[PDB]
Ligand binder design. Structure first.
Ligand SMILES: Nc1nc2c(ncn2[C@@H]2O[C@H](COP(=O)(O)OP(=O)(O)OP(=O)(O)O)[C@@H](O)[C@H]2O)c(=O)[nH]1
Ligand SMILES: [Mg+2]
Lengths: 180, 128
């Protein structure tokens, strides 16, 4: 009944809704990041055999974040979750140099996919916490990210396990999407 | 024509449902069985201070053998009177032989594919 209640509730009522698609090769750490967004990994974490969807709330936006398993068998189904995607989040294992080529290959197959034409692209160079994990500039070079022309993008180093640098990446992403 | 429908229905299984304290990220209650079985509405243990939690995250885990193209979810919270809760979510595509998870932030749950009812879940109450 107090003015603050209706004003806040109304503020929530008019928040834009967004669909964020989080992809990447298996073991890249997609699901851990999703869980760290709600501070949660209480060690119940195995490979994802489909999608994980979390509906949050952040920066005035209502987020629908779809995390789809990246093992070989599930990638041909990624295109089934393209439609209406506002932001594409590409998770990479910074310490898995043994796959950088496939990682780069999958990414490029995605960027020429017309259903993702206007999506903003955030690249999480995850697992930065590791002993000898690669640097952003390296990964950025290895992912031929300088050969992208149709998508706004930013590479952001982070560590899903400690939650370090996850918010700066998400914040930039929600900002670019705001510009439309 | 409905042989397919029968396949869909038969291949769906709702493994577990839980309730976490959003501000904490802690599981207050999680159950793994009797979720959609005939009988007494399985219930369980969720420490009453949930009303002292201003945010709750409901999470469901389901497996499906058959591929579906327009899967959705309807969650209504039910204690008699005028209704306290209506939740809807459209998943769309579901991969065959897949296991998926859905969670929302802040009791009969119905699953559908277009307008074929796939399953119904009813659980209940412990402010234990
Ligand atoms: N040291 C470290 N380990 C991480 C980090 N992120 C994820 N991991 C570990 O890497 C493993 C795979 O992480 P997941 O989050 O399950 O990977 P995913 O991308 O969801 O994998 P799929 O389900 O196959 O698609 C797990 O054992 C996590 O604990 C990180 O920043 N640092
Ligand atoms: Mg996963």
């Amino acid at each position: 009944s107090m003015g603050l209640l209706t004003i806040l509730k109304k503020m929530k009522q008019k928040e834009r809704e967004l669909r964020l698609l989080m992809l990447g090769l298996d073991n890249a750490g997609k699901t851990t990041i999703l869980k760290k967004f709600n501070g949660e990994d209480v060690d119940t974490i195995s490979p994802t055999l489909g999608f994980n969807i979390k509906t949050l709330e952040h920066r005035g936006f209502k987020l629908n974040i779809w995390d789809v398993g990246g093992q070989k068998s599930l990638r041909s189904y990624w295109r089934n979750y393209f439609e209406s995607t506002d932001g594409l989040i590409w998770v990479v294992d910074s310490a898995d140099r043994q796959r950088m080529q496939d990682c780069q290959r999958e990414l490029q197959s995605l960027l020429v996919e017309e259903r993702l034409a206007g999506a903003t692209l955030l690249i999480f160079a995850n697992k930065q916490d590791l002993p000898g994990a690669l640097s952003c500039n390296a990964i950025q070079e290895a992912l031929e990210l300088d050969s992208i022309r149709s998508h706004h993008w930013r590479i952001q180093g982070c560590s899903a396990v400690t939650g370090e640098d996850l918010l700066p990446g998400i914040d930039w992403l929600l900002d670019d999407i705001s510009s439309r | 024509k409905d042989e397919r429908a029968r396949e869909i229905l038969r291949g769906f299984k709702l493994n577990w449902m839980n309730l976490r304290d959003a501000e904490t990220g802690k599981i207050l209650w999680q159950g793994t069985e009797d979720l959609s079985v005939p009988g007494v509405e399985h219930e369980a243990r969720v420490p009453k201070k949930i009303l002292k939690c201003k945010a709750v995250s409901r999470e469901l885990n389901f497996s499906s053998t058959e591929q579906m193209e327009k899967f959705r979810l309807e969650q209504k919270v039910y204690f008699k009177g005028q209704c306290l809760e209506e939740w809807f979510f459209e998943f769309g595509f579901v991969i065959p032989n897949s296991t998926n998870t859905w969670q929302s932030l802040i009791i009969e749950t119905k699953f559908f594919d277009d307008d074929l009812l796939v399953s119904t879940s009813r659980v209940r109450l412990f402010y234990v």
